[PDB]
Design an enzyme around this catalytic site. Structure first.
Site, PDB file in Angstrom:
ATOM      1  N   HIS A   1       1.717   9.180   0.967  1.00 22.57           N
ATOM      2  CA  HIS A   1       0.785   8.909  -0.121  1.00 22.57           C
ATOM      3  C   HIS A   1       1.068   9.900  -1.233  1.00 22.57           C
ATOM      4  O   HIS A   1       1.168  11.105  -0.979  1.00 22.57           O
ATOM      5  CB  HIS A   1      -0.672   9.039   0.314  1.00 22.57           C
ATOM      6  CG  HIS A   1      -0.952   8.430   1.644  1.00 22.57           C
ATOM      7  ND1 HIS A   1      -1.603   7.223   1.793  1.00 22.57           N
ATOM      8  CD2 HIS A   1      -0.645   8.852   2.892  1.00 22.57           C
ATOM      9  CE1 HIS A   1      -1.698   6.936   3.079  1.00 22.57           C
ATOM     10  NE2 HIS A   1      -1.121   7.907   3.763  1.00 22.57           N
TER      11      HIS A   1
ATOM     12  N   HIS B   1       0.810  -1.213   0.000  1.00 21.36           N
ATOM     13  CA  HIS B   1       0.000   0.000   0.000  1.00 21.36           C
ATOM     14  C   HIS B   1       0.843   1.263   0.000  1.00 21.36           C
ATOM     15  O   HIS B   1       0.502   2.232  -0.682  1.00 21.36           O
ATOM     16  CB  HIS B   1      -0.935   0.017   1.216  1.00 21.36           C
ATOM     17  CG  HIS B   1      -1.566  -1.307   1.513  1.00 21.36           C
ATOM     18  ND1 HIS B   1      -2.481  -1.902   0.672  1.00 21.36           N
ATOM     19  CD2 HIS B   1      -1.416  -2.151   2.562  1.00 21.36           C
ATOM     20  CE1 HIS B   1      -2.865  -3.057   1.186  1.00 21.36           C
ATOM     21  NE2 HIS B   1      -2.235  -3.231   2.334  1.00 21.36           N
TER      22      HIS B   1
ATOM     23  N   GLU C   1      -3.845  13.289   0.645  1.00 14.73           N
ATOM     24  CA  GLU C   1      -5.136  12.814   1.125  1.00 14.73           C
ATOM     25  C   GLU C   1      -5.979  13.969   1.649  1.00 14.73           C
ATOM     26  O   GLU C   1      -7.131  14.142   1.240  1.00 14.73           O
ATOM     27  CB  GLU C   1      -4.935  11.755   2.209  1.00 14.73           C
ATOM     28  CG  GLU C   1      -4.054  10.613   1.772  1.00 14.73           C
ATOM     29  CD  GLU C   1      -4.413   9.322   2.461  1.00 14.73           C
ATOM     30  OE1 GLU C   1      -4.337   9.284   3.709  1.00 14.73           O
ATOM     31  OE2 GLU C   1      -4.767   8.350   1.758  1.00 14.73           O
TER      32      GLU C   1
ATOM     33  N   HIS D   1       4.953   7.210   6.818  1.00 11.11           N
ATOM     34  CA  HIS D   1       4.645   6.778   5.433  1.00 11.11           C
ATOM     35  C   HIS D   1       4.217   7.961   4.560  1.00 11.11           C
ATOM     36  O   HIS D   1       4.007   9.009   5.067  1.00 11.11           O
ATOM     37  CB  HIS D   1       3.581   5.652   5.416  1.00 11.11           C
ATOM     38  CG  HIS D   1       2.189   6.008   5.843  1.00 11.11           C
ATOM     39  ND1 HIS D   1       1.750   5.813   7.093  1.00 11.11           N
ATOM     40  CD2 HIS D   1       1.141   6.522   5.178  1.00 11.11           C
ATOM     41  CE1 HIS D   1       0.517   6.211   7.197  1.00 11.11           C
ATOM     42  NE2 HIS D   1       0.083   6.697   6.043  1.00 11.11           N
TER      43      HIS D   1
ATOM     44  N   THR E   1      -6.573   6.440   7.296  1.00 12.66           N
ATOM     45  CA  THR E   1      -7.030   6.682   5.933  1.00 12.66           C
ATOM     46  C   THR E   1      -7.087   5.417   5.086  1.00 12.66           C
ATOM     47  O   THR E   1      -7.627   5.460   3.976  1.00 12.66           O
ATOM     48  CB  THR E   1      -6.134   7.709   5.236  1.00 12.66           C
ATOM     49  OG1 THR E   1      -4.796   7.206   5.173  1.00 12.66           O
ATOM     50  CG2 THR E   1      -6.146   9.029   5.996  1.00 12.66           C
TER      51      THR E   1
ATOM     52  N   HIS F   1       2.740  11.038   6.473  1.00 15.04           N
ATOM     53  CA  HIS F   1       2.066  10.756   7.763  1.00 15.04           C
ATOM     54  C   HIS F   1       3.037  10.267   8.854  1.00 15.04           C
ATOM     55  O   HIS F   1       3.536   9.175   8.722  1.00 15.04           O
ATOM     56  CB  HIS F   1       0.921   9.767   7.534  1.00 15.04           C
ATOM     57  CG  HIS F   1      -0.236  10.299   6.761  1.00 15.04           C
ATOM     58  ND1 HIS F   1      -1.082   9.496   6.055  1.00 15.04           N
ATOM     59  CD2 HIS F   1      -0.692  11.538   6.593  1.00 15.04           C
ATOM     60  CE1 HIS F   1      -1.984  10.260   5.501  1.00 15.04           C
ATOM     61  NE2 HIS F   1      -1.757  11.473   5.804  1.00 15.04           N
TER      62      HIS F   1
HETATM   63  C1  LIG Z   1      -3.392   0.304   9.414  1.00 11.13           C
HETATM   64  C2  LIG Z   1      -2.369   1.254   9.918  1.00 11.13           C
HETATM   65  O1  LIG Z   1      -1.511   0.877  10.651  1.00 11.13           O
HETATM   66  C3  LIG Z   1      -2.406   2.668   9.477  1.00 11.13           C
HETATM   67  C4  LIG Z   1      -3.352   3.089   8.564  1.00 11.13           C
HETATM   68  C5  LIG Z   1      -3.436   4.414   8.199  1.00 11.13           C
HETATM   69  C6  LIG Z   1      -2.592   5.376   8.742  1.00 11.13           C
HETATM   70  B1  LIG Z   1      -2.901   6.913   8.582  1.00 11.13           B
HETATM   71  O2  LIG Z   1      -4.117   7.352   8.214  1.00 11.13           O
HETATM   72  O3  LIG Z   1      -1.979   7.834   8.917  1.00 11.13           O
HETATM   73  C7  LIG Z   1      -1.635   4.928   9.650  1.00 11.13           C
HETATM   74  C8  LIG Z   1      -1.546   3.605  10.015  1.00 11.13           C
HETATM   75 ZN   LIG Z   2      -1.561   7.344   5.975  1.00 11.01          ZN
END
Ligand SMILES: CC(=O)c1ccc(B(O)O)cc1
Ligand SMILES: [Zn+2]
EC number: 4.2.1.1
Length: 257
Positions: free
Chosen positions: A93, A61, A103, A91, A195, A116
């Site tokens: 996006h 992902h 996002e 991470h 998200t 993020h």
């Molecule tokens: C599943 C998970 O561990 C995770 C999913 C989304 C985000 B985020 O919206 O920053 C962070 C972690």
């Molecule tokens: Zn995220």
């Protein structure tokens, strides 16, 4: 499972994750003129001096830089948060093109990408317990536009060839996330969720107003990643962002005027 294509993308997530249609979903569009400056907001505190990165992983992902959250080493406090939130991973996006990827949006504007920095409340013990709480997570969102190169990001750009396909991971110690922060800590804040699935509504979102600049080559290296696993048809990891969701019974506060 779930993905970002036309058959498994966000518009399909609600079937396996009903909360997708929830009451505090992320991301959202930030109406800078409807957000209200909140005096009671305390100053943000980013204490990343003792941050300890360990690995970088391609999960199919995105790619996560993971940290050693066994101690209070890189924490986020102040602002709207009550307590201490430990950095577990960060991470991005990003989009197939520079005009998309983020996002969250600012007055409907989409950025090239969004970083993020994920932290979890230390009163819950661990991340798996924290995601089950309304105030279990605090996510620092930082927008990324194409322009000058972000030196503190090159170390991450250089290692991505080692984690090109889903499942691959690589040692990644001694990364300083402070090189990814912008000049100002001005932020909007609101209650939201992860998200991606499971889309748990456990997140306090702190989105910084000031973006960080990255070069077109730095994001190009982002686009060279793979959704698929090794030995599978190549799907390029691009447009791995959830679109803005309904704001509903929520107000977005700002730390500035
Ligand atoms: C599943 C998970 O561990 C995770 C999913 C989304 C985000 B985020 O919206 O920053 C962070 C972690
Ligand atoms: Zn995220």
């Amino acid at each position: 499972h779930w993905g970002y294509g036309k058959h498994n993308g966000p518009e399909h997530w609600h079937k396996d994750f009903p909360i997708a249609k929830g009451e505090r979903q992320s991301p959202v569009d930030i109406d800078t003129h409807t957000a209200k400056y909140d005096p009671s907001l305390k100053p943000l505190s980013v204490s990343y001096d003792q941050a300890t990165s360990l690995r970088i992983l391609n999960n199919g992902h995105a790619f996560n830089v993971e940290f050693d959250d066994s101690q209070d080493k890189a924490v986020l406090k102040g602002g709207p948060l009550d307590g201490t939130y430990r950095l577990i991973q960060f991470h991005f996006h990003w989009g197939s093109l520079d005009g998309q990827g983020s996002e969250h949006t600012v007055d409907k504007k989409k950025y090239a990408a969004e970083l993020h920095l994920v932290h979890w409340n230390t009163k819950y013990g661990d991340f798996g317990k924290a995601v089950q709480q309304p105030d279990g997570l605090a996510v620092l969102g930082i927008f990324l536009k194409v322009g000058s190169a972000k030196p503190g990001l090159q170390k991450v750009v250089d290692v991505l060839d080692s984690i090109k396909t889903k499942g691959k991971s690589a040692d990644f110690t001694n990364f300083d996330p402070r090189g990814l922060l912008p000049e100002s800590l001005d932020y909007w804040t609101y209650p939201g969720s992860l998200t991606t699935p499971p889309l748990l509504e456990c997140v306090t979102w702190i989105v910084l107003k000031e973006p960080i600049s990255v070069s077109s080559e730095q994001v190009l290296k982002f686009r060279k990643l793979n959704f698929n696993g090794e030995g599978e048809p190549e799907e390029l990891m691009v447009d791995n962002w959830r679109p803005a969701q309904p704001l509903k019974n929520r107000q977005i506060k700002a730390s500035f005027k």
